[PDB]
Amino acid sequence: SLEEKYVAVMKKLQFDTFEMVSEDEDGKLGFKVNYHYMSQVKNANDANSAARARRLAQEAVTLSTSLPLSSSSSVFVRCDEERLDIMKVLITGPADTPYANGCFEFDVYFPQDYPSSPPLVNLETTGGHSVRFNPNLYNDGKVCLSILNTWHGRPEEKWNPQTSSFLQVLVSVQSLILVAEPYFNEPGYERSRGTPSGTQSSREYDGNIRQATVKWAMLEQIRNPSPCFKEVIHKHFYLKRVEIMAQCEEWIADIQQYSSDKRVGRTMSHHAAALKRHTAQLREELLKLPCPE
């Protein structure tokens, strides 16, 4: 029943409009919230092709109709009230992964030649560029994907102005970046998947990613929520607060199981201590979280 309630409540908040950019009387672009592609937006020409506007409108129709939504993972999109090329995306990490139940924020800007070029996507929950959440998610926020022409891949895996869509980009992010074993996303280590050394390296990477996720994807998102998704973040955390506690306890136990390793034991102990501190802070914040309207 909890999953059904979560699906029902979150569905009304999957797609909405928010005022990210407002123009003053002079005619300059004022930004009300932080945006990664601010410079390119300020330099965007007004000679926009009507094809770009049509494609953006059709993509908006598709997003309002068929955005993914489930207890394991969900997608939330906010579009500017006066600019179709300004969009922020919040993705909840799929279960059974180190990103599970983590709220990750993205900034998407559509270039002037869109859909000829893939839209630019930049991760915002980088923790001040101190965390590399994935081999394809660099600490600077760049996202590497074949469909964005930022990664090596087949022509059918590259951006196609006629067939590729933004919903496909979101689904690809969910199904390829936030995976069960992110350590093997690297195109060199995947040939040692299942080997003992590869398993140990994957476990270390998973521990680091779990501690980073608890530190940033939920702690900072509940302490300083973005204005765009604030209601969504609050409702999601309030609905899933018990599951967060269970997941954190399971992660702590699992990481403490391998704290006696002779090769990575010190890193396991460090990650476990950081995870315990983050869990205590999360406990405090969730206890202080009021019931959303």
Binding site: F15, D16, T17, N34, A44, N45, D46, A47, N48, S49, A50, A51, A53, R54, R55, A57, Q58, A60, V61, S64, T65, E82, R83, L84, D85, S116, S117, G128, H129, S130, Y138, K142, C144, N149, T150, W151, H152, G188, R191, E220, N224
Partner: protein, 989 residues
């Protein structure tokens, strides 16, 4: 030595060997008409050691309309044409020793004096004397290159003769392309398997060399001729005796000398080998050759050119052409129209055609003394018959001279078209090389010189640079750092005192649309672009579409060039083009897995960006946002997160205090860049790891790194250390001197520096409190100078630093290094350019402007694409407009706009209903620019239908109308929304 500050762009085209061969070359040029003047100008801009101009005739009032250097004083004093321009010609390039000659030319003249020169160009000279000269020149050992160029009215002629045997050292001038090898077959013959994808695009008969091939150690360094089998394979010789093949391989193309043949002039006249420029009329060049030969015979037999409109002269010329044609080997048919028009405009002279032919001939001359490209073989017949074809049958009195400077142009295009040229309000964008040549063409054609009407507007915000003097002939060394537009306007007035030019320093961009409003474009009659980037071209084209104004576009890249003609309601626009997306280096290739020198150069460039432009700006912004560092410490102690606070506080702790610390920082950065990175990358991916397919992870195109230990004795290491130290000292605002940069001083500084061995909130707090205690928090400490990438200035050390870093990275990845100039070109994306191509495309664009002004039908306009390297010149019809249908038989083009009118209570449904009633189709979504106004599926917009226009858009009072874009529902479900033409709506009536 060659001063790069003046010839950088030409060196990027010709190269060092071509430049050295250009020096110590003496060129003789005869005939100082318009064509000869253009050739001399292009050659003296190129940088020939010495040019001799020869002419025997005196100045005349008729010469003002064809020569852009003569003045009334020369006519009054009856000065020799060669001498009257000698002073002005030398001003273009002080390195060129220009000399004048006036020795008479005739059959009995001692012609042995030409042996001193190396290339002779003849213009406006009798044909038999050309035969004699060409007979003499080709018989010399070594042969003296001969080029003949002439212009008669709207018909031209070009001829080359570089001896019976001529050798070219570079067939096309294109850089060899590196090819990756996947498999080698030990068989007779061997078979090459190209790497996955990446077609080689080679041809049978070429020579290919191989290197870095495992197994066949004997095939490395060998040269083998290939035989194309497939786009990913070819055939090599015997490899059976060799050892088997494991993996890897690199193949690059080897250029080989080519020998071309030429025939004597007296033999080419009986069966010429012309060059085809218009494939619709392949037989046209032969007919033009026949007509011009008939013209020369007429000149011989009557000692005068045919008179304008004389029937007997035309009949005589036609009879001569018919007699000549049957003696030709191919027996062509005499073209009545071509002969008639040649007779009609025999005495005339066209300026843009002369400029184009001069550019081509100058390029051929450059080929003659260097062998850089494949020379023309063996004729070239450019023409502008389209100018007069649309005129019908004009009266002879219209072409008669009137006694002014425009007598030459009038004798070509009639008086009416000349007058319509003098009353043009033409807007020219950009004042580069093409802009300067177009201004010269305007001055020669008298564009906008009428008192009542006519106005040329030229805008360019840049300033004159030393390297711009090589290609833009309107400027002088004392014009450096002056505005381009003002200098060009002042210089053009000298050529023609009747011109009326307005120069603006404003750019052309959306931010400056307030001055170049729709009324301004309506006032104009034709817009010509001389831009260098695509975004400005697209903006100008979009602006022209909204006002229905003709647009002429041009652009040159090295020896390549192209022109495009856009006419309202007739042709497609520039934005209609859809070029394929360009290949871009992925993040993995640039950051960690480079394969070519370009990758390391780009890595050096953006490393310089991050090190001295981006991060200092972040530092300044962060510290100006939070003035008090103690306040920042307090906020950190209270758990307040800040953007990039850790990065900035790390920057503060490592801020150097004097020159020695800057040298230490340079050493640390060198170690981090070229020793720690390779070690950590090999640690992450050991060299011996295998993949599932069994291929090594470091297979091609990936290359394994190797640590480079610092050594001050190495010139490259010392260069990098010096440049990095200078840049860091400048950024951190500390003084330094030249002796502080010496090798000995550097040795004494870093000799005691320990080097770290290869292997956050608390550290940030510790650093901040230590800095506060150490008083390193003054307003000077919280600011850091930001540098900009000035590639043109050689003394700032930017290019030296980038070159040193790129070469070091290449040495780390076993890639061969690159010289300073190649790094300067690639990192600074300097587009190669030369004067000849710009002059040629300017002449062609001027011809297109004449066509546009004449209001000629669609068939007359011709787009041109030329590449002087081959050389090839292609004229094709411009792409016609395309009808686009949507529904109910309604169709629209790119030039169509719809207009609607509303009122105060005009709601959104009112506007939609009005458009549906007017055009029979229902709009479904309305968007101004990037602002959405009605999207039914989007939540919060169904109720927007009731909303009035003034509330929906919240418009400004500056304009009563806003430009909108609409779309319509598809006639079949499952398809995207049908496109629609832009619609302009007025809030009132």
């Amino acid at each position: 030595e060659i001063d790069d500050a003046l010839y950088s762009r030409q060196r990027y085209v010709l190269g060092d060997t071509a430049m050295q061969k250009m020096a110590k070359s003496h060129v003789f040029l005869s005939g100082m008409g318009g064509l000869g003047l253009e050739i001399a100008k292009n050659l003296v801009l190129a940088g020939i050691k010495a040019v001799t101009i020869h002419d025997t005739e005196k100045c005349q009032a008729w010469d003002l309309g064809t020569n852009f250097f003569l003045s009334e004083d020369d006519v009054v004093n009856k000065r020799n044409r060669a001498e009257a321009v000698l002073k002005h010609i030398a001003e273009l390039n002080p390195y060129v020793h220009v000399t004048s000659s006036s020795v008479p030319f005739n059959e009995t003249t001692d012609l042995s004096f030409l042996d001193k020169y190396q290339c002779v160009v003849l213009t406006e000279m009798k044909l038999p004397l050309q035969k004699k000269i060409n007979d003499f020149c080709r018989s010399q050992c070594p042969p003296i290159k001969f080029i003949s160029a002439d212009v008669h009215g709207i018909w031209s002629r070009l001829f080359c003769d570089f001896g019976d045997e001529f050798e070219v050292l570079d067939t096309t001038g294109e850089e060899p392309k590196e090819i990756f090898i996947s498999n080698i077959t030990q068989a007779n013959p061997g078979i090459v398997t190209c790497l996955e994808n990446h077609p080689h695009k080679l041809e049978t008969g070429q020579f290919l060399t191989f290197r870095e091939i495992n197994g066949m150690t004997g095939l490395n360094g060998s040269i083998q001729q290939i035989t194309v089998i497939s786009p990913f394979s070819f055939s090599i010789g015997d490899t059976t005796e060799l050892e088997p093949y494991l993996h890897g391989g690199i193949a690059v193309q080897v250029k080989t000398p080519k020998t071309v043949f030429f025939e004597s002039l007296e033999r080419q006249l009986k069966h010429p080998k012309c060059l085809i420029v218009d494939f619709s009329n392949p037989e046209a060049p032969l007919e033009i050759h026949t007509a011009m030969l008939a013209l020369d015979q007429f000149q011989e037999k009557y000692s005068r050119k045919p008179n304008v409109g004389c029937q007997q002269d035309s009949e005589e010329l036609l009879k001569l052409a018919t007699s000549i044609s049957e003696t030709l080997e191919e027996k062509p048919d005499v073209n009545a129209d071509i002969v008639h028009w040649l007779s009609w405009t025999a005495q005339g002279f066209l300026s843009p055609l002369a400029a184009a032919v001069g550019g081509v001939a100058s390029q051929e001359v450059l080929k003659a003394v260097t062998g850089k490209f494949s020379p023309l073989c063996q004729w070239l017949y450019l023409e502008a018959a389209d100018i007069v074809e649309s005129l019908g049958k004009p009266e002879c009195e219209e072409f008669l001279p009137r006694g002014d400077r425009y007598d030459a142009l009038r004798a070509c295009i009639g008086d009416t078209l000349c007058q319509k040229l003098q009353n043009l309000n033409i807007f020219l964008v950009g004042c580069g090389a093409i802009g300067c040549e177009m201004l010269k063409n305007f001055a020669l054609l008298g564009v906008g010189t009428s008192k009542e009407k006519g106005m040329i507007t030229v805008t360019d915000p840049d300033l004159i640079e030393k390297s711009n003097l090589n290609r833009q002939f309107l400027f002088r060394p004392h014009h450096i750092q002056k505005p381009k537009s003002y200098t060009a306007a002042d210089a053009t007035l000298k050529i023609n005192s009747q011109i009326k030019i307005d120069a603006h320093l404003n750019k052309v961009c959306p931010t400056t649309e307030t001055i170049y409003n729709d009324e301004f474009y309506t006032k104009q009659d034709v817009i010509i672009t001389a831009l260098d980037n695509v975004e400005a071209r697209r903006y100008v084209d979009s602006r022209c579409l909204a006002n229905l104004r003709p647009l002429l576009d041009s652009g040159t890249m090295g020896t390549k060039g192209h022109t495009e003609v856009i006419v309202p309601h007739l042709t497609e626009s520039y934005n209609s083009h859809r070029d394929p997306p360009e290949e871009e280096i992925p993040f993995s290739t640039l950051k960690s897995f480079p394969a070519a020198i370009e990758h390391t150069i780009q890595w050096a460039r953006d490393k310089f960006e991050s090190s001295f432009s981006h991060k200092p700006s972040l530092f300044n912004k962060f510290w100006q946002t939070y003035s008090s560092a103690e306040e920042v410490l307090q906020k950190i102690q209270s758990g307040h997160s800040l953007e990039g606070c850790f990065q900035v506080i790390k920057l503060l702790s490592r801020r150097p205090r004097n020159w020695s610390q800057c040298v230490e920082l340079a050493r640390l950065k060198f170690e981090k860049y070229f020793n720690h990175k390779a070690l950590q990358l090999l640690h992450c991916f050991p060299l011996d790891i295998r993949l599932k397919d069994g291929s090594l992870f470091w297979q091609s195109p990936k290359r394994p790194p190797s640590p480079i230990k610092f050594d001050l004795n190495e010139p490259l290491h010392l260069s990098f250390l010096q440049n990095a130290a200078k840049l860091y000292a400048t950024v951190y605002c500390i003084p330094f001197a030249e002796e502080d940069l010496s090798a000995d001083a550097l040795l004494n500084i870093l000799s005691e520096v320990k080097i770290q061995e290869f292997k956050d909130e608390r550290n940030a707090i510790f650093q901040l409190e230590k800095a506060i205690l150490s008083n390193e928090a003054t307003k000077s400490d919280l600011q850091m100078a930001v540098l900009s990438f000035e590639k043109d200035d050689d003394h700032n050390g930017h290019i030296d630093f980038i070159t040193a870093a790129s070469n070091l990275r290449a040495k780390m990845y076993s890639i061969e290094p690159a010289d300073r100039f190649k790094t300067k070109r690639i990192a600074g994306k300097i587009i190669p350019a030369i004067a000849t191509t710009t002059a040629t495309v300017s002449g062609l664009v001027a011809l297109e402007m004449i066509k546009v002004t004449g209001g000629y039908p669609f068939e007359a306009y011709k787009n041109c694409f030329l590449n002087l390297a081959i050389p090839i010149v292609v004229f094709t019809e411009t792409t016609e407009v395309r009808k686009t249908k949507i529904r109910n038989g309604i169709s629209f083009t790119i030039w169509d706009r719809w207009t609607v009118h509303g009122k105060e209570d005009f709601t959104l449904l009112d506007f939609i209903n009005a458009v549906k009633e007017k055009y029979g189709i229902e709009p479904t979504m309305v968007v101004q620019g990037v602002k959405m106004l009605y999207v039914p599926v989007m939540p919060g917009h169904a109720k927007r239908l009731k909303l009035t226009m003034h509330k929906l858009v919240k418009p400004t009072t500056e304009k009563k109308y806003v430009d909108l874009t609409v779309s319509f529902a598809p006639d079949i479900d499952g398809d995207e929304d049908l496109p629609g033409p832009p619609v302009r709506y007025y809030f009132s009536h």
